[PDB]
């Protein structure tokens, strides 16, 4: 029955470690990466884990008593030494499906990510994966639009699409940096966006950059006869100050905005996800921040769990980094977290840093955006890793090609075309890459500007997180 | 250095590149039959990228084995509507999405 | 003039690195520490760091010489070795006002930690203190009533408030909720609060808990003759679902809120705080997930940067660690970060890692709330810690009492009173501190009682984040 | 559900022309919608497109671009194509709207597809 | 016809019957012959099952129509005609006549639950 | 097997049988006057589906008893309006809806 | 692949009878019991309700190749005689996960029950069960707040809760209507209601009763000590 109230405090490992709990299909799992302050039992450090991030304190309370703690409790169901490495172990943590607010990214960090990760008896805490179970996923809009209805809207077919950022990141006015978008329009490229930290500032206010670029991707449109679009920046302050400023895009007919999901935060993400579901505008979700949590292998959340966040909470693009540009990317961890994003069914697979079997339940797919100190040489690369549904975006590869935009543009429009033939036609890009960019450079002389400016340009260091 | 970009108007996938080869036509309609894609031909009197449709040549070639046989419908549609552009797409069913798309043919100037 | 357009890519310390750079106070400071990857110069790190979180990319762009480049760049003006550690600097770089838009704690972090984290060429990154311009600082609300506006709305004067979460921390239906509530204020507590993953869940759907709180927040009150208070949380998935659920308490006429400002989101927060202030509610933040970015020094974001920020987006409560307790937290850092939360000056003091003078321009303080495995011999520490302007709360400490609720709840307030009178008599409490528990258990049965339980409890281990 | 009775079948209701004037009833009715749709001096043809379910939301435009440019006055949803993880609402009205304008534009006769609310 | 009371409807509009479910173009006389002009006719099957696709399908079902409407003003007999009807306009209209050739068997013919 | 559909405007009832011979019509107009429906002519310069409104050739033919009266009109108004879309209409009074209506004369190409 | 479109009426039977499935956990399955008309197989006719609730139609339409048939049809997975029955079967029938909006009872129904129940080829239908998955049932808010909190709001413990519906069912004023319910809950009744068909009519509009009523909740209220509630037919 209530067995008794004995007040004082116990091991959390008497109630938490349960080492022979098979997980049910509805329960959510996680993957903690673990080490033990010296004299603290990984067992009793999973425990704890297990404690603190579902129903436990730190000394024992008669409360537990009126309730049925065995349905609530998180289960470390199973513990096992990180292989090579002292003091290193994976917990695996088992939450059911009651203590989670149905549709609320936002809830499910609060508990799994909470408080744990600061505990005394613990050096160091990393959130390797969380399997969502299907019932869970199924409380949650997910992207807009996701993938297959992008490319219906845009009538976008056959390839990556290709995009880029405006430079400087801050200083231009409203007029420059519409010129700036329409020079690269023009020039091939599908999309132009805003800088990260491009929202509102006094050299540049947005209600004026709305506009002004409204008016670029109309001229460049009418041009080219392709649809182009902007993803216009509508991070904000406030609630309110950002739903206003989506609400101006949708005024102008623009596409699609962009929204910087960490800083501002899920609750915001949550609501403006669903509004542009409403509303038919796609949303593209920039990362900013998440280098902060997400890059050392011994202690935060690794990216792979903050995809499968947002592709939760809602977005249509989520950047996935690029492998071989400025930003870090382990390409095994990549290829695995772009599989969770993009797919229905991504079977555990370790190799890759998949964990647990993930199931959509066709929550429609976001489509990965590779972007970050690219330039012509990584496309056949890019085209290999990432296939047809991403996004490749060029900013100082675009803006920085001696001629201009409108031919930094065509460069890498032509390059990227001439990819997706060769790779269609049977040729290896991994072996040929350099090849076939030489060739279509003989004919293309904004491409052969571009070999020539970049040909000695690598970004090769050691990746911190590593597998 | 530097020359100004001049302004043309351009078809989607493929219209960077120069002109397609019919063997280079051939070779995607390959790669559409191997990778078990649907070709559809379909045609239309104006490329404007704001719409969504486009008139459908007779059926989709669903059980395509032969590209000649995508390339014999391509030219039947021609002689029938050579003032029209003409787009040869490849249709996943699993995913159901269009996964090829390149035009084939543009009208009499 | 505007110096000539030539493409391809330079070194960031050319632009970027200002060893000579003198900043201005309208100029917004940020003190990195950084390790560099293997054959990457300080300087070249430095730069780069400045570069990629003001108004660089990776190569030469024509656009720099449309604007004011000088004007806007972020300026690497300072670089130190961490002293006795091999490959580590400080960084000190400033940022001009105009880079960032007002009111907006989401936009400053996404330059200043946006996307330099992951950068390849550097190790490990964490930043340490932000200085905030006195310019900026006006541009926010701040908290929403701030310290001495509570304790007048409260009429608690006179010694530190105490508070208690309610545990288990799910499992609990609504009604078994409000009891827990009841017994814990009666017995003298000022406030009880919602665990921070308490939101709205299948077992106590929000509504219902607001609703049985506000009647057990009526009869405890009515017993006792004291204010009493209760954090409800309205931590939720979108913007609209929070307001609502703010909404609600103040239709119950409810005093105090909380919100989990990190896994809500600055957007969502900032929202929240302005709405407070509009409606007379007190709003307690809860931080988690603040130790999955500030816990290790060698990366991340140091807490009393999120503190800072917390304090220019709103909240009159802000957990602070106990140092003593369950959770890890170092003692002189704390020292230092709570000036920064209730100060109105503090001056610049690398040994309790304040890195630059901060003004704050009459913007009112915040209330540290010292709570997590703490109990009753803890109070004379916590009491000598952070003073009367300060919550300390007791959750496993109130309702793990062998007694239950209302005499733990006695027990912890006797403790208390015990040793504000005994500090204001001139009693030092670090060496007399048992001694006056001891005497004061000697008339109080239930603090006899808590003080026999608690014991030999203590927690003591390696601080991660040290200086 | 009376015990007493085994089966019990409503086969009339006379309503009262008094109840009758209290309600609205049809938002226009036969005459006003030959007058909005031009449609005058035969039936009037429709379509439900198929597959049931299972279409997205541009092969559904599709299917109705196609039936409408060729003589059908109108096309609709299934009863049961609401909003649906295959095809959302919203995309698919977008996209019917598009092919009701090319189809109308093609034919020169007034074109419609029930949108299912 | 099961009409157990007289109804007046005060001017209240009439609504218009719409006639759908497994018919195809050799139903077309009897339709117009039951529902008469006010009345919509839908073929879904009967229109996308069409061997040559979707348009064609249309086109056959509303020449089909029209050649009824025109033979009954006419004053021919719709019932014992409709037949003829059809493979006269069959003759000049290629997609009417691959929909007759393809559901020239199919009918729908059990008994009736619901008797009066 | 299968052909393409042909774009081809079309005219609302009747407009997708062959064009009906003068006899056609006037058995068109006779079950009109049959019926007890009032026939009227109207033309038009364009045939856009979206408007309401043609103008009115004179007046309703209101007891209209001979099909000769009928196309009497339709060759009166051709002779004036030949640039003109022609549309025979027969209007039921107690229901009060136009119950036939169909194109007896398309303009000069 | 998609295996070229032959136009023509085929048997259902030969896409929707498929006795060899084995239900997910994220099926909907549904039970029926059916009579199928004279010279139709048992077979056919689970096949074809399993085809028209689901994807199917009377003739092999083109537009099912651009989609993916498989995933999305109703499946018939068997078929058994009803014990001591003539002509007379259960069919369970699965149905992905994917056919049915979110929260809606309305969109579920329209599916399982919209047209079947009509076709000419059977003579009875009933359905007789549903089981709804887990991952469905999350979608939808259930009932408002629920046996225990019920009980807790009301402070009603330990036995079964007494209620009376008001008579005649028709034909009250308001204020007679408030009487007879401030006379019954003063009793010891927890609850009174409003008959079913008690709306708004001539006799006694729905504000004035509304009114009456609470004056009467809070009289009893206030006599008993115990909480009282009316259904107030909304
Ligand atoms: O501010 C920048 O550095 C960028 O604009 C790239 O500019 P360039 O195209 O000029 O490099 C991108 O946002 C990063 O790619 C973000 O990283 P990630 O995609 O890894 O989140
Ligand atoms: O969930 C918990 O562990 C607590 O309720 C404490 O319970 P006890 O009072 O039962 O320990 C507090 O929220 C933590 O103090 C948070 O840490 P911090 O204040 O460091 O953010
Ligand atoms: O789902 C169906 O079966 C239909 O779409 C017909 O499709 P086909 O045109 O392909 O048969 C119709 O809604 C039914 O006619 C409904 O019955 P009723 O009109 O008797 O309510
Ligand atoms: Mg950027
Ligand atoms: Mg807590
Ligand atoms: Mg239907
Ligand atoms: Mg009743």
Known sequence: SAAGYKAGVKDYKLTYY????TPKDTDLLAAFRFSPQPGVPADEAGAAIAAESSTGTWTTVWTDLLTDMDRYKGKCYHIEPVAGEENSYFAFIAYPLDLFEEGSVTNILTSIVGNVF?????????????????????????????????????????????????????????????????????????FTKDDENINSQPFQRWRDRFLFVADAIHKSQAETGEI?????????????????????????????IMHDFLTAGFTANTTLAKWCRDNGVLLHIHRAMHAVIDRQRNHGI?????????????????????????????KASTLG????????????????????????????????????????????????????????????????????????????????????QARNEGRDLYREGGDILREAGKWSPELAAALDLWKEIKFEFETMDKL | SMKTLPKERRFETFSYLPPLSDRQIAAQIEYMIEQGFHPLIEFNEHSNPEEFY??????????????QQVLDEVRECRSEYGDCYIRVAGFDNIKECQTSSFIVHRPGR
């Not at chain 1, 349960?18 to 709990?21: A, F």
């Not at chain 1, 947002?310 to 382990?330: A, C, F, M, N, P």
Request: proline share 6%; hydrophobic share 40%; with cysteine.
């Open chain 1, 302 to 330: 690794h990216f792979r769990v903050l995809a499968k966040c947002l592709r939760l909470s809602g977005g249509d693009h989520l950047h996935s980094g690029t492998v071989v540009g400025k930003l870090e990317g382990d």
């Open chain 1, 337 to 420: 977290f772009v599989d969770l994003m993009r797919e229905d069914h991504i079977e555990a697979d370790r190799s890759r840093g998949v964990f647990f079997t993930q199931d959509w339940a066709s929550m429609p797919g976001v489509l990965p955006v590779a972007s970050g100190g690219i330039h012509v040489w990584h496309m056949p690369a890019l085209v290999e890793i990432f296939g047809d549904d991403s996004v490749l975006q060029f900013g100082g590869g675009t803006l920085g090609h001696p001629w201009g935009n409108a031919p930094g543009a065509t460069a890498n429009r032509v390059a990227l075309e001439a990819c997706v």
């Open chain 2, 54 to 67: 486009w008139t459908m040549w007779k059926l989709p070639l669903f059980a395509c084995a032969a590209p």
């Open chain 1, 228 to 256: 182009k679009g902007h993803y216009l920046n509508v991070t904000a302050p406030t609630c309110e100050e950002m739903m206003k400023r989506a609400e101006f895009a949708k005024e102008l007919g623009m596409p699609i």
């Open chain 1, 118 to 190: 600061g505990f005394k008896a613990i050096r160091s805490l990393r959130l390797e994966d969380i399997r969502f179970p299907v019932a869970l996923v199924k409380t949650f809009q997910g992207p807009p639009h996701g993938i297959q209805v992008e490319r219906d809207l845009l009538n976008k077919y056959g390839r990556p699409m290709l995009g880029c950022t405006i430079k400087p990141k801050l200083g231009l006015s409203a007029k420059n940096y519409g010129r700036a978008v329409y020079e690269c329009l023009r020039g091939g490229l599908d």
């Open chain 1, 18 to 21: 349960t080492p022979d709990y």
